[PDB]
Design an enzyme around this catalytic site. Structure first.
Site, mmCIF file in Angstrom:
data_model
loop_
_atom_site.group_PDB
_atom_site.id
_atom_site.type_symbol
_atom_site.label_atom_id
_atom_site.label_comp_id
_atom_site.label_asym_id
_atom_site.label_seq_id
_atom_site.Cartn_x
_atom_site.Cartn_y
_atom_site.Cartn_z
ATOM 1 C CG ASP A 125 -31.257 -90.341 17.081
ATOM 2 O OD1 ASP A 125 -30.606 -90.088 18.120
ATOM 3 O OD2 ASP A 125 -30.715 -90.458 15.958
ATOM 4 N NE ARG A 158 -31.980 -83.006 25.522
ATOM 5 C CZ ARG A 158 -31.617 -83.322 26.762
ATOM 6 N NH1 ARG A 158 -32.209 -82.768 27.814
ATOM 7 N NH2 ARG A 158 -30.657 -84.226 26.952
ATOM 8 C CG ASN A 159 -34.054 -86.187 22.505
ATOM 9 O OD1 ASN A 159 -34.095 -85.325 21.629
ATOM 10 N ND2 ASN A 159 -32.964 -86.435 23.214
ATOM 11 C CG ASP A 212 -29.761 -86.896 24.143
ATOM 12 O OD1 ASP A 212 -29.791 -86.511 25.339
ATOM 13 O OD2 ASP A 212 -29.830 -86.088 23.197
HETATM 14 C C1 LIG Z 1 -40.827 -74.738 20.734
HETATM 15 C C2 LIG Z 1 -42.205 -75.338 21.011
HETATM 16 N N1 LIG Z 1 -43.080 -74.970 19.915
HETATM 17 C C3 LIG Z 1 -44.472 -75.267 20.238
HETATM 18 C C4 LIG Z 1 -44.986 -74.435 21.409
HETATM 19 C C5 LIG Z 1 -42.631 -75.688 18.725
HETATM 20 C C6 LIG Z 1 -43.570 -76.862 18.472
HETATM 21 N N2 LIG Z 1 -42.952 -78.123 18.117
HETATM 22 C C7 LIG Z 1 -43.209 -78.519 16.752
HETATM 23 O O1 LIG Z 1 -43.868 -77.791 16.088
HETATM 24 C C8 LIG Z 1 -42.706 -79.839 16.168
HETATM 25 C C9 LIG Z 1 -43.551 -80.717 15.535
HETATM 26 C C10 LIG Z 1 -45.046 -80.499 15.307
HETATM 27 N N3 LIG Z 1 -42.831 -81.776 15.150
HETATM 28 C C11 LIG Z 1 -41.556 -81.610 15.518
HETATM 29 C C12 LIG Z 1 -40.417 -82.599 15.257
HETATM 30 C C13 LIG Z 1 -40.558 -83.752 14.613
HETATM 31 C C14 LIG Z 1 -41.791 -84.427 14.137
HETATM 32 O O2 LIG Z 1 -42.914 -84.051 14.231
HETATM 33 N N4 LIG Z 1 -41.402 -85.673 13.504
HETATM 34 C C15 LIG Z 1 -39.892 -85.788 13.577
HETATM 35 C C16 LIG Z 1 -39.016 -86.778 13.124
HETATM 36 C C17 LIG Z 1 -37.641 -86.637 13.328
HETATM 37 C C18 LIG Z 1 -37.132 -85.495 13.992
HETATM 38 F F1 LIG Z 1 -35.784 -85.375 14.180
HETATM 39 C C19 LIG Z 1 -38.007 -84.496 14.450
HETATM 40 C C20 LIG Z 1 -39.387 -84.638 14.246
HETATM 41 C C21 LIG Z 1 -41.459 -80.392 16.169
HETATM 42 C C22 LIG Z 1 -40.189 -79.787 16.762
#
Ligand SMILES: CCN(CC)CCNC(=O)c1c(C)[nH]c(/C=C2\C(=O)Nc3ccc(F)cc32)c1C
Ligand SMILES: [Cl-]
Length: 302
Positions: free
Chosen positions: A181, A167-168, A163
């Site tokens: 993942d 986005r990932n 995938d």
């Molecule tokens: C929608 C966009 N927004 C910003 C403008 C939201 C911002 N995005 C965020 O805050 C965000 C942050 C700062 N970390 C994550 C996700 C993970 C991370 O950090 N370690 C992981 C380990 C595993 C997993 F499965 C996900 C994560 C997000 C979505």
């Protein structure tokens, strides 16, 4: 289930059953030293939360929702087992610890403060400049390089992502990108970038033809998805095949060799990479090791 797989030689390759991988309790971290903050993402049976780990640092913790099926609890343990098996690389989201006894399973991973690369590109788009806190072509070439290195690492561990997409990919301090993942921390039934196919929901616009039409996932199909990722990257976050619905017409076009045109900001050498990643013949696509070498040459020429 949309998630990565470790494979073993068989068939050519077959998925391993991740429940059979070992779990080293050296990863065990005291649950009482975690302080939970905001939720970063949430699926139907799980979520990932920002946390403080004392012995202080900010981490991300994956965990199940209370409504989780027994096979979900095993699934989260299998996520932990795969992460422990892969080991550490700068360009993946790494395992830092786990809590498996004294309560529900917690998987502690690295926290990436800027979130997913797709949304980062989209909000940086109108300030982008090819050359000189602007986003620049130098950054995009760096992101391409790092994702290729991270994927080369996964492939070297016989791991197939299945995938790969912007986005990932997560972004953290120092412009470091990390492949992720989401697993049980994402529900794809929400996201229109996934498409119904039989019982499954699949990221069709990122998938190699042999994955769509023959259910074949390989190191080579991951390279196809990397090419789509490059197109996302140098289009500053546009959706692929823009304005084209996924229908029988789209499938026929892919089968007959239709591909996306070059993004306006892609260097010709990077579009050349995209084109070879999208070869209908998987044997003619570059390996990630080759891609890393090619991008290293471009950065040197930069
Ligand atoms: C929608 C966009 N927004 C910003 C403008 C939201 C911002 N995005 C965020 O805050 C965000 C942050 C700062 N970390 C994550 C996700 C993970 C991370 O950090 N370690 C992981 C380990 C595993 C997993 F499965 C996900 C994560 C997000 C979505
Ligand atoms: Cl780097």
């Amino acid at each position: 289930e949309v998630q990565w797989k470790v494979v073993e030689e068989s068939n050519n390759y077959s998925y391993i059953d991740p429940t059979q991988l070992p779990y080293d309790h050296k990863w065990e971290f005291p649950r009482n030293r975690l302080s939970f903050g905001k939720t970063l993402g949430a699926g139907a049976f799980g979520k990932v939360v920002e946390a403080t780990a004392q012995g202080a640092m900010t981490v991300a913790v994956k965990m199940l929702k209370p409504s989780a099926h027994s096979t979900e609890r095993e699934a989260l343990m299998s996520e932990l087992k795969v992460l422990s098996y892969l080991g550490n690389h700068e360009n993946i989201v790494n395992l830092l610890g786990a809590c498996t006894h004294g309560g529900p399973t917690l998987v502690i991973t690295e926290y990436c403060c800027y979130g997913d690369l797709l949304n980062f590109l989209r909000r940086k788009r109108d300030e982008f400049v090819p050359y000189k806190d602007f986003l620049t072509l130098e950054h995009l070439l760096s992101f391409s390089y790092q994702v290729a290195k991270g994927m080369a690492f996964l492939a070297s561990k016989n791991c197939i992502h299945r995938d790969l997409a912007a986005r990932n990919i997560l972004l953290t301090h120092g412009n470091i990108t990390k492949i992720c993942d989401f697993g049980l921390a994402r529900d794809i039934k929400n996201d229109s970038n996934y498409v119904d196919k039989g019982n499954a929901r699949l990221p069709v616009k990122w998938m190699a033809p042999e994955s769509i039409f023959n259910s074949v996932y390989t190191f080579e199909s991951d390279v196809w998805s990397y090419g789509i990722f490059l197109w996302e990257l140098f289009s500053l976050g546009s959706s692929p095949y823009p304005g084209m619905p996924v229908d029988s017409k789209f499938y026929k076009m892919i089968k007959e060799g239709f591909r996306m045109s070059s993004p306006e900001y892609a260097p010709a050498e990077m579009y050349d990479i995209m084109k070879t990643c999208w070869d209908a013949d998987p044997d003619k696509r570059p390996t990630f090791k080759q891609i890393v070498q090619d991008i290293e040459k471009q950065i040197s020429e930069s």
